[PDB]
Symmetry: D2
Subunit: 462 residues, 4 copies
């Protein structure tokens, strides 16, 4: 056993499963807004000799010795992150160690808040994330609600926008120490200038979780949260086309300068943030993942990346206009970013039966809740997004053909409803019936023939 043997020989069983996954991605359409293909150059650094390194601490304060090369890699990633967002090093910092986005959020609450403190964020059914705090009627589901106190704020049902008026009303009576400003299923741009006024009145920190729109802020196509914020957490695997990891930004320097005589009150975010990640919550950083992020951040400072972000917006407005002509209703009347929310209630079909029938035609999409929903098990909407098919060099003319396959698949779903009853009898009718299963076969063949003719970023067989 030398340890230098290829996977094709040592483990034949695992090598076969690794190829079936690559074939599944190249023959189907990907409409999920939280997925994006990764570059080959980043994958070569994700699996290298850096996995065999065990360092603990921060550059210049290592525990063990011999960490001379990894210090230059971590200090290099901290300079490419402050330049991709055009930040001033003397006024901002960055921490490139959290394992993912969810660990990045818990490290912010532990650093700035005592246990059982009050936090306020967007509600989950209305387009917020689970890490912002979530409770059921009989159980605490999220860890943020187990160790802290949470209270949500909701939207305006008749417009679909965030209700800033009611937010300022309940904030004075609840008085939270932290307010979160981030969404995961929202089609409009958040008004950061208004949420800053609510925080200055009740005296609280403002956290901006921009994990979904992180790739658009770097290309300067939408206004940046950094203008009115104190802490900014983001992921590196959503719209940045990088390896899975996390990032944390914080301000540093003078705060309320000139309060009396010649005083200079400074920010105190730097020390508390670094201590919460290590040695409190985490152990040894994944040095291989940090190197893959530095490769992706360098690609975000190029003219090519700006032309990619401009196409993500044009591919979303082209898909939204095509749906309205077919006879559909969009939540909030349109879109301003990279995703489109659909409302299928006028069509007479729910999002649960539509998501299933599209899965058999190799079209991936997830159901979404709508403001007028009586039952949660059958949402009446879908959530579509354009960041992953754009990587395969899709254009506006190609996105209009995707709608033709979607509208044709919904019509097949409106025939099964006229013959079945319960949803459990809907899934079993798409298989045992030879008539419905034959029409589904003629549609799957036309989708795979169309999607297989586009380039796929990555390697070439795994």
């Amino acid at each position: 056993w030398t340890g230098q043997e290829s996977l094709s020989d040592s483990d034949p069983e695992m090598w076969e499963l690794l190829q079936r996954e690559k074939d599944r991605q190249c023959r189907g359409l990907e409409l999920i807004a939280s997925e994006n293909f990764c570059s080959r150059a980043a994958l070569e650094a994700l699996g290298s000799c850096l996995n065999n390194k065990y360092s603990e601490g921060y550059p210049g304060k290592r525990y063990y010795g011999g960490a001379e090369v990894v210090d230059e890699i971590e200090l290099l990633c901290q300079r490419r992150a402050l330049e991709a967002f055009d930040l001033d090093p003397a006024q901002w910092g960055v921490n490139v160690q959290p394992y993912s986005g969810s660990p990045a959020n818990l490290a912010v609450y532990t650093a700035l808040l005592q246990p059982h403190d009050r936090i306020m964020g967007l509600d989950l059914p209305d387009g917020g994330h689970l890490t912002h705090g979530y409770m059921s009627d009989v159980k605490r589901i999220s860890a943020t609600s187990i160790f802290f106190e949470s209270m949500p704020y909701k939207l305006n049902p008749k417009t679909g926008l965030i209700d800033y008026n009611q937010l300022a009303l309940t904030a004075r009576l609840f008085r939270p120490r932290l307010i979160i400003a981030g969404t995961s299923a929202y089609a409009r741009l958040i008004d950061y200038a208004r949420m800053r006024e609510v925080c200055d009145e009740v005296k609280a920190h403002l956290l901006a979780d921009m994990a979904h729109i992180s790739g658009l802020v770097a290309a300067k196509v939408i206004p940046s949260p950094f203008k009115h914020a104190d802490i900014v957490t983001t992921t590196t695997h959503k719209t940045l086309r990088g390896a899975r990891s996390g990032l944390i930004f914080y301000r540093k320097g003078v705060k309320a300068v000139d309060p009396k005589t010649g005083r200079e009150i400074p920010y105190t975010f730097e020390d508390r943030i670094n201590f919460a990640v290590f040695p409190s919550l985490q152990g040894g950083p994944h040095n291989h993942a940090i190197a893959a992020v530095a490769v992706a951040l360098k690609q975000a400072c190029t003219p090519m990346f700006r032309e990619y972000s401009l196409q993500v917006l044009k591919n979303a407005r082209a898909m939204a206009d095509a749906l309205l002509e077919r006879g559909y209703s969009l939540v909030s009347g349109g879109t301003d970013n990279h995703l489109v929310l659909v409302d299928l209630r006028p069509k007479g079909l729910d999002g649960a039966r539509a998501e299933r029938v599209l899965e058999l035609v190799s079209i991936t999409a997830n159901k979404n809740t709508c403001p007028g929903d009586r039952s949660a098990i059958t949402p009446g909407g879908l959530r579509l997004g354009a960041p992953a098919l754009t990587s395969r060099q899709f254009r506006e003319d190609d996105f209009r053909r995707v709608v033709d396959f979607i509208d044709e698949g919904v019509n097949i779903g409106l025939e099964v409803k006229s013959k079945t009853a319960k949803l459990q009898d809907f899934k079993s009718f798409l298989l045992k019936d030879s008539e419905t299963s034959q029409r589904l076969a003629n549609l799957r063949q036309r989708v795979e023939q169309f999607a297989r003719a586009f380039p796929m970023p990555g390697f070439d067989e795994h």
Copy 2:
């Protein structure tokens, strides 16, 4: 931009740093007990197309659709883990989702304990881990002590072994709900049969964190914690030679069978453990890391792996016998596993000055606390281990030559003490003085010439 470009062309700067790290590993000796080189077959699966997949939940209960191939990969990793340790599937389970070892521990406390509950584990200065709970005199350093209550137990100063007598005395007065049985700097085998009796008396769960000895239990060279335990957490990157990840085991089935008439009280660990990882603490699993673990677990069920574990023990006893002949004192009088603790107090040199001078000769070792230590900044011991050099096909005859370089480096450190005073004046004397720096150069050349002639597992340039 096609996305299929090699790292040598797209990012020349990052490619140069990736080669300097590979050269540093092949020319130096590695004596840290928490490091081990990884196979090439595992690294090829760590960086593949599985990074571009976003699944949430567990097999058969996915959120989105299209997760047909990744379900077979996750179910395959759950069968290779129960077979590497010769477990019965009807009596044990496994969870292969935690990001690392530290997240694996916090997911156990959140599932079985309410906030501000009592936990008892080994003290950090005495050979325990930071995730078991640790507090300073003025501050809470570990997250386990921030969200839960902790109280440690200590060793016997005059023997170096765990004091089981005092453990049963303070357990009746503190009455903890959970007891941890795991070490990170211990040279003997823990007595699990005795710690089980303490848990049955005060009625508490027993957790066995075997992250350090996980590779020896699989080869059946030392007794297994599974015989007297309920939960077992371990890492996959210490002695298993795999990618960085985590594992959690739990019992299932009947518990106190036949309590009355024909009752069968079952275990209730399965549901609470799975819910604590998702959706409470974590988000999307790293599917690429899970595939690399299944490649490494398959290598642990082979006759070749047993011959490797037998050599790890013989290489430790050979290094321990060589140190006693040179005139040294070992903590607890010897070793029974993969590491050796040294006591340099009779030699007149501390572990802080010894760790530094060895770093200049490309010999990596970390200082360790000793039972009679007045100051914590200058520990009087070292922690040496044999699992990584054994991967490069080292033998007993080669480990005796490593001691010749260690004993020769300590003698150089005993000359600087006769000329300097404060430790800050010790680091600056090894550089500016041309006489001491020249003798250090003649020793570094002989170490690199010796260590470069052994095979290195991995790829061949990165």
Copy 3:
């Protein structure tokens, strides 16, 4: 030393102070709504041989022995309490052990709520009590907010009534486990039927703290909280004319009868309430105070007591009509119970300067906050009440003369404002100036001559 010596001989110094207090009460007017004179028969039982008894527990479950007589006294007080409010013994219980009203509230939170649970009650500036939860902007002032989580609800500024619409809005987003329905500075009757609907929607307990209106509910002059409530706490020294103590009521019996087949789900308030008082929070009951309460509760089941409560209402409406004719503004436009709130802002004088000048004329009244108040140190209102002067056989014709002394004292306060500036210069102008101090002397002589001609309940010199 025999121990049977009168206070006039053994302690001459304390006997002189005990007579100066009795003279101060008989020569001045008492307008505080939280005070009432006590009967002589109750005071004779407050200081007897029952002070020399040490029992612990509840009747039939005593710790020590010999508690044969005190069991009949405690069981007698539990029957007179259920009869004064016309309660059914098979559907209600009572606990006659809390030391006062504040201890009675904390014993309810500890029995039905875990630590750090959510409670909602009326805000302190708006007419609620401090034991319902209160927090400053920089500090937690009340013990209810230190051990539990609280969030208040407010009034309608333009009407002065409780805003039930906003209460149901914030209750769905905060979801409290307990809602309190009690006031200490409110002139209207609370709508218990509406607050019951808010509790049935979010599933929470309803607590009715009726410490202020406890004497009116017993006489059946206002609707009783018992019709829509689960727990009722009250004091025995506000409008019941008894010794200082506390009471706790709770329902018992079937709850949601007939849920399935022949099930009968019962109430579980009885055991948890009794355990929270003893042995959790308190020690040995004050048996002398319990005997004085049984004497006062027997007087509340008489026709004489109903004629007293009818006069308390007529004496309040007569005082309110007299103030409007003089040129004053009442909060909420009038009164429906035993107190009257005044608004002095149109008159050009604040409540801080008015409360002080009335104290020099032996007229006791406390300032009250008004909805349009910029500064909290100078409230613009007063709080007047009629339960204590009614005990001295005051009538409507006599209450109209009290307003003549109040309106004459305010006019003296409007002259000092034209000569002074800061409030600290207002207090010092009422003493050093011989002209203002002489006019104050001619008014004090006319008040004491009028108030000294009415009977005073109690003894006759102490």
Copy 4:
């Protein structure tokens, strides 16, 4: 209804029960150590016109007005308390507002400790109080353990004394923020000089709860806790012969004077203690109870009170010597204060059957736990004390006759054991059997004839 009617006329039923209690006290023997008769002069101030006063706050900082006389009464009680214990006003303070002893303890924890802090005190089965923290195996019984964390320390089984060696061992591993030094069933003097060293090592406050020995410290017969303590809580109704209330002492002034240059670090106990009582935990003080305490504290500064405390000690040593001659075993071999612990195990009778048979002969005594007790429902000891019979002018010659009635009652209890089995069959044999019930009648007549010839402090019929 004038309100000036005697209790004999207005409430004939309550007046009859008030006389049966006075007759029960004058015809029986009282051996409980937590009871003592009260002076007539104190009872006259307990029930006066001060009950009809509602003040809130502290002297000089009242809420309402007109509190001119009660300020001189509260300031007078604060001077008699600092003089009864010979304290320096410039170095000590006092708070005379807590309702009883149990509320006095909770006000100390809330002022100096955050929620869920660590406290250590004597265990309940071993002679400590319930307010020091107590937990069962399945439930939290005390409120101190619900809001704070507690861990007890125990005695030495083979000597009966406090084990100071084990206390210093577990204190370093638990590290509590507060240590309590007070007992309720202990026959020896606590070593305060040793417990002070344990607090200086782990840096913690020392609380001295001297509720039982408060009357002996004032007479200078035993060493005072004030020499080595920071906070001292006590009751006024145990050995001080006063009304039921509470007291809290605290140090003030310079602490670690001269730490650097000319610094003077002061104590910070004054502000935090006063805020915890009001407005946090309590409401309106019972002014009638405060006046009765000032009458009792004045009697403690007299030569007559010292002669009373000297007789309490001589009456305990005389009762202890008489028990050893009869053939009994005393816990810890004797007594040093006001109580005597007995061990009935050699006699073959338990404390449960002995306490019952003595109750039928009008001899009151409570059972006590012994170090070798397998079952808690049948303790093998009794707790006897001498502070209440000494008030009736008992002497050493009279206490020897009490033992003759005790030893004669135990012999009657040793006959029923030879005829019955279960304890439930023991209680029913003392009534239905005419032979055992007749011998009990001849003994009760001789006790009442003897105890009725001694003076009883108080009034003369109630």
